[PDB]
Amino acid sequence: SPADTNVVPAKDAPTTNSPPSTTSPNQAAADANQQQAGIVSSQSGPNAVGDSAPSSSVNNDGDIITRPTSDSIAAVANATKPAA
Prior knowledge:
- The protein is mostly helical.
- The protein has helices at residues 25-33, 69-77.
- The chain starts with 24 loop residues before the first helix and ends in a 7-residue tail after the last helix.
- The PDB classes it as viral protein.
């Protein structure tokens, strides 16, 4: 039977349950990365105190982004267009 043997991580599987937050997301993405799994807070001692997961609110360099990286480069290159 398929679905019990063909189990593989989905599309954008590290950062898909990450909520959009502008504050300390990595600890907020990991707060909901392990909430969708169903683990309650009492069943995790220090495993859920200070954890981190990659978020969709952080770009690769590491600065807390809001709009995606293709729309942030476009936020700079649209402000250096003089009249030709």
